[PDB]
Amino acid sequence: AGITGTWYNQLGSTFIVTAGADGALTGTYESAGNAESRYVLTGRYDSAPATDGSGTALGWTVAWKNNYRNAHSATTWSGQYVGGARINTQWLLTSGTTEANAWKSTLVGHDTFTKVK
Amino acid sequence: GITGTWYNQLGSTFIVTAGADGALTGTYESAVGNAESRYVLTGRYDSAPATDGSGTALGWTVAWKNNYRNAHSATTWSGQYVGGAEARINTQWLLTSGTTEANAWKSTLVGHDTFTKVKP
């Protein structure tokens, strides 16, 4: 599948993921390297992608709580893996809010990951 | 709490278990799109939310492949659980399809789903 291993974005973050035979993504996301910056990652990917040259669809979630800190928020990345290699994503980061602040609960952006720093 | 059976505004069925460790696991059945029967989901949630009245942040992913169909796509829902008399999970979602590079600009749909423990 080409997905298992370590990936790097262009802002200093890293994740290490295993792509299981059953379509599972499991691993760890580390922001820009110590234990306090590491969080559980889980997701899913298409384990039988098309053969016409299309990318492999996938997504994952990190909730920004670990043993050391809690931002009361979670990011989901939705994207596709392109081999030959990159993972091109768009993401949604939702923070827990009161109802009065719910309109401003969600940031949107995009990340590209490569196998080289 | 989060563990239970939820339905969105379209009648899709979201059966989820919230684990003590922050894990979300379960199955998703979509009432719309290139989907049939149940699909595996996994995700994460804040297992120690704030006590100031804020909702509980969470997210999960479904890859739209099961034993019946494969749409070559995945949806992620990002949102928050809001407790109360009518508990709700308010989300926004991104549905990315595998595409060629020339079609990558149109790979991703965006929307918003609200889930309650009652079917519409």
Coordinates of C-alpha atoms in Angstrom, one line a residue:
Chain A
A1 CA 0.0 0.0 0.0
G2 CA 3.1 2.2 0.5
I3 CA 1.5 4.0 3.5
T4 CA 3.2 2.3 6.5
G5 CA 6.1 4.3 7.8
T6 CA 7.1 7.8 8.8
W7 CA 5.7 10.9 7.1
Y8 CA 6.7 14.6 7.5
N9 CA 4.8 17.8 6.7
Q10 CA 6.3 21.1 5.7
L11 CA 5.8 22.7 9.1
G12 CA 7.9 20.5 11.4
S13 CA 5.4 17.8 12.3
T14 CA 5.8 14.0 11.9
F15 CA 3.6 11.0 12.1
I16 CA 4.4 7.2 12.1
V17 CA 1.6 5.0 10.9
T18 CA 0.9 1.3 10.2
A19 CA -1.5 0.5 7.4
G20 CA -3.1 -2.8 8.4
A21 CA -4.4 -5.4 6.0
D22 CA -7.9 -4.7 7.3
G23 CA -7.9 -1.0 6.3
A24 CA -6.8 0.3 9.7
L25 CA -4.4 3.2 10.2
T26 CA -2.8 3.2 13.7
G27 CA 0.1 5.3 14.9
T28 CA 1.4 8.4 16.6
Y29 CA 1.5 12.1 15.6
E30 CA 4.3 14.3 16.9
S31 CA 4.2 18.1 16.6
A32 CA 7.3 20.2 15.9
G33 CA 9.5 15.9 19.0
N34 CA 9.5 15.0 22.7
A35 CA 7.0 12.9 24.6
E36 CA 4.9 15.9 25.5
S37 CA 4.3 16.5 21.7
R38 CA 3.1 12.9 20.9
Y39 CA -0.6 11.9 20.4
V40 CA -2.4 8.8 19.4
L41 CA -3.5 8.7 15.7
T42 CA -6.2 6.4 14.3
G43 CA -7.9 6.2 10.9
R44 CA -8.9 4.2 7.9
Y45 CA -7.7 3.8 4.3
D46 CA -9.0 2.0 1.1
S47 CA -7.1 -1.3 1.2
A48 CA -8.1 -2.1 -2.5
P49 CA -7.7 1.1 -4.4
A50 CA -8.5 1.5 -8.1
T51 CA -5.9 0.5 -10.7
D52 CA -6.5 3.4 -13.1
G53 CA -3.8 5.6 -11.6
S54 CA -6.1 7.2 -9.0
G55 CA -4.8 7.9 -5.5
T56 CA -5.7 5.9 -2.4
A57 CA -8.3 7.5 -0.2
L58 CA -7.7 7.7 3.5
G59 CA -8.3 9.7 6.7
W60 CA -7.3 9.9 10.3
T61 CA -8.0 11.7 13.6
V62 CA -5.9 13.0 16.4
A63 CA -7.5 14.3 19.6
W64 CA -5.1 16.8 21.2
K65 CA -5.0 15.1 24.6
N66 CA -2.0 13.1 26.0
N67 CA -0.6 12.4 29.4
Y68 CA 0.9 15.9 29.6
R69 CA -1.6 18.4 28.0
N70 CA -5.1 18.7 26.7
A71 CA -6.1 21.3 24.1
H72 CA -9.8 20.1 24.2
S73 CA -9.8 19.8 20.4
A74 CA -9.4 17.3 17.6
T75 CA -8.1 17.3 14.0
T76 CA -9.3 15.1 11.2
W77 CA -7.3 14.8 8.0
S78 CA -9.0 13.6 4.8
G79 CA -7.0 13.0 1.7
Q80 CA -5.3 10.6 -0.7
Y81 CA -1.9 8.8 -0.9
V82 CA -0.1 9.1 -4.2
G83 CA 2.7 6.6 -4.8
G84 CA 5.6 6.6 -7.1
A85 CA 5.2 9.7 -2.9
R86 CA 2.9 12.1 -1.0
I87 CA -0.2 12.2 1.1
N88 CA -2.3 15.2 0.1
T89 CA -4.8 16.2 2.8
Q90 CA -7.3 18.8 3.9
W91 CA -8.1 19.0 7.6
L92 CA -10.7 20.2 10.1
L93 CA -9.7 21.2 13.6
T94 CA -12.7 21.4 16.0
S95 CA -12.4 22.8 19.5
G96 CA -14.9 22.1 22.2
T97 CA -16.9 25.3 22.8
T98 CA -20.0 26.7 24.4
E99 CA -23.0 27.0 22.2
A100 CA -22.5 30.8 22.0
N101 CA -19.0 30.2 20.5
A102 CA -19.9 27.2 18.3
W103 CA -19.8 29.3 15.1
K104 CA -16.0 29.7 15.6
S105 CA -15.3 26.1 16.7
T106 CA -13.7 24.8 13.5
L107 CA -10.6 25.7 11.6
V108 CA -9.9 24.4 8.1
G109 CA -6.6 23.9 6.2
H110 CA -4.4 21.7 4.1
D111 CA -1.2 19.6 4.7
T112 CA 1.0 17.7 2.3
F113 CA 3.2 14.9 3.8
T114 CA 6.3 13.4 2.3
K115 CA 8.6 10.5 3.3
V116 CA 11.6 12.9 3.4
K117 CA 12.0 15.8 5.9
Chain B
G1 CA -22.5 10.2 26.8
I2 CA -21.0 9.4 23.4
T3 CA -21.4 5.7 23.4
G4 CA -24.6 4.7 21.8
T5 CA -26.5 4.7 18.5
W6 CA -26.9 8.0 16.7
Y7 CA -28.6 9.2 13.5
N8 CA -27.9 12.2 11.3
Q9 CA -30.4 14.5 9.6
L10 CA -30.3 12.2 6.5
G11 CA -31.1 9.0 8.5
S12 CA -27.6 7.5 8.5
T13 CA -26.8 5.3 11.5
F14 CA -23.7 5.9 13.6
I15 CA -23.1 3.1 16.2
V16 CA -20.1 4.1 18.4
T17 CA -18.3 3.1 21.5
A18 CA -16.2 5.6 23.4
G19 CA -13.3 3.9 25.2
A20 CA -11.7 4.9 28.4
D21 CA -8.5 5.6 26.5
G22 CA -10.0 8.1 24.0
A23 CA -10.8 5.6 21.3
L24 CA -13.9 5.7 19.1
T25 CA -14.9 2.4 17.4
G26 CA -18.0 1.2 15.7
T27 CA -19.9 1.0 12.5
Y28 CA -21.5 3.6 10.1
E29 CA -24.4 3.0 7.7
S30 CA -25.0 5.8 5.2
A31 CA -28.4 6.6 3.9
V32 CA -26.9 8.4 0.9
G33 CA -24.1 8.0 -1.6
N34 CA -22.2 5.0 -3.0
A35 CA -22.7 3.0 0.2
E36 CA -24.4 -0.2 1.3
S37 CA -24.7 -1.8 4.8
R38 CA -22.2 -1.2 7.6
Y39 CA -18.7 0.2 7.3
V40 CA -15.9 0.2 10.0
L41 CA -15.1 3.4 11.7
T42 CA -12.3 4.5 14.0
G43 CA -11.6 7.8 15.7
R44 CA -10.7 9.7 18.8
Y45 CA -12.4 11.9 21.4
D46 CA -11.3 14.1 24.3
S47 CA -11.7 11.8 27.4
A48 CA -11.3 14.7 29.8
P49 CA -13.3 17.6 28.4
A50 CA -13.3 21.0 30.0
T51 CA -15.7 21.7 32.9
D52 CA -16.6 25.2 31.8
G53 CA -19.7 24.2 29.7
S54 CA -17.9 23.4 26.5
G55 CA -18.6 20.5 24.3
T56 CA -16.4 17.4 23.8
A57 CA -14.2 17.4 20.8
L58 CA -14.0 14.3 18.6
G59 CA -13.5 13.0 15.1
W60 CA -13.8 9.7 13.2
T61 CA -13.1 8.2 9.7
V62 CA -14.9 5.8 7.4
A63 CA -13.2 4.4 4.4
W64 CA -16.1 3.4 2.0
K65 CA -15.0 -0.2 1.4
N66 CA -16.7 -3.2 2.8
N67 CA -17.6 -6.7 1.6
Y68 CA -20.4 -5.3 -0.7
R69 CA -19.0 -2.2 -2.3
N70 CA -15.9 0.0 -2.6
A71 CA -16.4 3.7 -3.5
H72 CA -12.6 4.4 -3.4
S73 CA -13.2 7.3 -0.9
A74 CA -13.1 8.2 2.8
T75 CA -15.0 10.6 5.0
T76 CA -13.8 12.3 8.1
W77 CA -16.2 13.9 10.6
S78 CA -14.8 16.5 13.0
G79 CA -17.0 17.9 15.7
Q80 CA -18.1 18.1 19.3
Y81 CA -20.6 16.3 21.5
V82 CA -23.0 18.6 23.3
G83 CA -24.8 17.1 26.3
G84 CA -28.2 18.2 27.5
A85 CA -31.8 17.3 27.4
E86 CA -31.4 16.6 23.7
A87 CA -27.9 15.3 23.3
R88 CA -26.2 16.1 20.0
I89 CA -23.0 15.6 18.0
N90 CA -22.4 18.6 15.7
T91 CA -19.9 17.9 12.9
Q92 CA -18.4 19.1 9.7
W93 CA -17.0 16.5 7.3
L94 CA -14.6 16.1 4.3
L95 CA -15.2 13.3 1.8
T96 CA -12.1 12.7 -0.3
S97 CA -12.2 10.4 -3.4
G98 CA -9.2 8.8 -4.9
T99 CA -8.5 10.6 -8.2
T100 CA -6.0 11.1 -10.9
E101 CA -3.8 14.2 -10.5
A102 CA -5.7 16.1 -13.2
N103 CA -8.9 15.5 -11.2
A104 CA -7.5 16.2 -7.7
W105 CA -8.9 19.7 -7.6
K106 CA -12.4 18.1 -7.4
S107 CA -11.5 15.3 -5.0
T108 CA -13.1 16.6 -1.8
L109 CA -16.7 17.3 -0.8
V110 CA -17.5 19.3 2.3
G111 CA -20.6 19.3 4.4
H112 CA -22.1 19.3 7.9
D113 CA -24.0 16.6 9.8
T114 CA -25.9 16.8 13.1
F115 CA -26.4 13.6 15.1
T116 CA -29.0 12.8 17.7
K117 CA -30.1 9.6 19.5
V118 CA -33.5 9.9 17.7
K119 CA -34.1 9.1 14.0
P120 CA -35.6 11.9 11.9

